[PDB]
Symmetry: D4
């Protein structure tokens, strides 16, 4: 089926993180595509991708990047689609450079930013799912089931 979400990431090294978004979208039966695209190192590849996303039928972009992380924000510069950003954890600064580079977007060019690392990738997929669920009742039901099961599965007392 035609992708409605695009997962893009700056590098192969970002995939250990962004695969969590891929897995969750697949689990919720959301057709999507997964690509490597760098703002800083393949800027023209990014311009092409972002400019044509809407016409290609994408509804949400999930963008993961670390360091001087510009991929989500430059994606958002070229598309009117909602862009969600995932700060990939960095070696020295533990993703704080990633986070501030992504979240502190200027007024007029939004990126909805999630947690540093794998939890953020998962939440970007879940946030994308909640956006798509607004217009897709079957997906809304799947998402409801998924969230309810998460809540129901939290243990009640610790084991030693």
């Amino acid at each position: 089926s035609a992708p409605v979400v695009g997962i893009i990431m700056g590098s192969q090294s970002d995939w250990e993180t962004m695969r969590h978004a891929d897995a969750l979208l697949t689990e919720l039966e959301i057709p999507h595509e997964t690509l490597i695209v760098s703002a800083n190192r393949t800027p023209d590849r990014l311009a092409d991708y972002a400019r044509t996303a809407a016409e290609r039928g994408l509804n949400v972009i999930i963008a993961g990047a670390g360091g001087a992380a510009h991929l989500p924000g430059m994606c958002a510069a070229w598309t009117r689609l909602p862009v969600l950003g995932v700060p990939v954890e960095s070696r020295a600064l533990k993703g704080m450079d990633s986070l501030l580079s992504i979240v502190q977007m200027p007024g007029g060019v939004p990126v909805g930013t999630l947690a540093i690392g794998a939890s953020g990738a998962k939440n970007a997929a879940l946030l994308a799912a909640s956006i798509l669920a607004l217009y897709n009742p079957a997906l809304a039901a799947r998402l409801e089931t998924w969230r309810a099961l998460q809540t129901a599965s939290v243990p009640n007392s610790p084991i030693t």
Copy 2:
């Protein structure tokens, strides 16, 4: 018209920031409601607001708060709707971390600290709604084109 976006904020002091979200939704003719809800001072108010938002017809909730800023994450805890979070100016760094570092399973789409984040939460809510509303999508396109076109070429 019936609201399709809810703007909630932790206190009156958050309004200087969150009014920028209100103004933007109004500018794009997105019907919305604007309320004060405190996660810590009015937890039952928040539970009922977030639990009932979808059945009331809301599509997106924009939540802003300062300090430990529990409001956006706790709103997300109780609604299936997309929740967008605005850290209100530790300069909002405490708010930023308590909003953006949400656990896997409970997303808050987080925007910049302060007025720009508030404006952007409204624009992000607009881009979500635009996916299903062609007239709004065109107005949003116009808004974004005007932004780009209006940036001066040189400083005064």
Copy 3:
């Protein structure tokens, strides 16, 4: 004996930290209960727990949480009992996200916050004990003995 302290924590992964509070309460012969409850993922479970704590005879709640740590503060929102918060250390941000999410509570809803990690859990139990000792002379004596023994046991010179 009926619990007078409740130790609650967001997850099983928080137990490596919060077990230090459990152990200290047991050492001081303070009857308590120990549960997993997440603000973000089991909010209704938390509302139930916090609302009924006082009527169930609890006097102090110790709440441990990491990340966007909301469990102590939301517990405090629903109970008039004193709530002590333990920031659990986080992977990327080393518990700074935990700490600021817990300590920076708005005026009107207190959480007494302890150190990041195991030392904080121990100190939350000790602070709970000092609160209970105000009205419990036998516990006050045990606590006095415990603190005096800590002080007496600090070595006087380093060994190589």
Copy 4:
């Protein structure tokens, strides 16, 4: 009446912050004393204050200080009573760490940086005292109910 809470602060400049603790205890009719004590400039004053607090009938000590803020932890070092710490505005980040990162064995229950922390230290002290004082417990319940009920529904 004889004080059951002691508010101590590192200097006169801390009063702008700590007066919020004083005001709250007075509002709840909790008898208390309010003093300046410097861990580093008046260490013997602090030792004697903290050592003798319990025998003087104090139940809780609220300590506020800025900078390296040694006062709350050193107070806890010398008393068996619960000590609550208020970092006074590095924006109070230095104070926060020197108060909250106390070693195992010597607790300080730490509140928010600034005026809100001071108010909350008094409320936390009140919630401790309420465990043994039903009339105060009812006044505290009233205070918390008024807080919740008084939050506006929408911004002005």
Copy 5:
């Protein structure tokens, strides 16, 4: 004369900072152009500016921006020319990290946060140009000697 340095900045609000770069280049008689270019609001403007800079005869680009400050790194992404970056006052700490932490392969020579960084970006651009322009190199030597010589010996 035709510009050999381009000063670009993210918005009008960056001018209070970046004018210090402008003033310094003028003082050293380095022909330059001074423009507003937004990485996020005018991405095509930036792509065309940076792609064409070398063929237009520019030798160095000085780029300043605040917030997430995408401008200097994205400029470097599209030009082979040296790009120098000025974080504009999170106090410019966000800007600093988004400028200085560029990946291997895409350098931005980063200067101090604020007005001093702007002045220094111009001086650094001057020191680059001086390598090939003896008259400028002598003027730069003079500028640096005057700086050193002019520092007072004692405070007033």
Copy 6:
């Protein structure tokens, strides 16, 4: 051939980082020299080096240092040449001490600062190359080729 770039570093322990600058300069066929010089511990050695750099025919200095990192800034104090600084990652503070000590130079004494760690060393060499390419067409061609190859070699999709 006579060196046109000088790579200086505070210590042998800085070489694991600064060797990336050395390697890139060699790859681009830029003659250079590589030395250990500490601002804090061999200040007179630094004064000699920096004062004579221009007359020795150097065009760009790359200076790497960690901690209370003063080598780039003190080099810049004594030379009119462009000085590029590389913050070497530090144990406790992860190079933040290095970064702020290098980047926050006073107005009048520039240091062009690159990323913390190896990526910064590589980028200092690349920035030096772009400076030299302004007056050296053959090097400009090599640098163009190198950057184009970097962009062309970025993969398009992640592998699992």
Copy 7:
């Protein structure tokens, strides 16, 4: 009398801070000199100052600077004398790290950011000199006793 402490600072703008060191030394009747020396703008001035300090009869150097604050560490690099460092208000956090994180072999005894650090650098210099000067040691004892005794017991 001939100076036994040198106060040096990076610029005139550091004087608002460093005058507190000057005032304290004067109060304790410690002869001293007060100068501007820039590590980065006047490196030869600093080299000569620090190299010759001991032979000129100085015993302690107090150095204050802001920003990257190279002055205290570079002073220590060239003198065998004790060097005390004052970070001048990134709020002085950059200065603090560039002063305190000196490598093994080249100490700077670092004081608090700002005016309090400056006062304390002078007091620390006084405590060093007092080891060999009984009259000063008594004046310092008096100063410390007056400090302790003068702290108010309660806030106004």
Copy 8:
């Protein structure tokens, strides 16, 4: 010989750091004593130590502490002697809690603070030595020799 420097530290766990101060003082033939004393956990032991230091013939105190590090500052509260502080690196916050707790002393109560960790301990001993050298010509000569040898021993080029 009678100690003229006292090295005090909060705990045995601080000794891995503070032993570097001990070693350097011994190398420079500076008689000293080495003790464990905690501000937070043995405050009366600290009061006794600090109050009597001057009368016992100590000239300089070196105090090492981690976390909510109060030992140097409380030592300085009770002695007129110069107190040098060494922030011991902490697990979560990498010694930043240690550093700010020690360096940010109020006006009127100085602590001369050195680097986080072992380098700071070494520098506290060296700073103590430079203080003592003011009145001790033989030690001044030893210290001169030591610093000159450090400078002379810095290598000139890196090895691979």
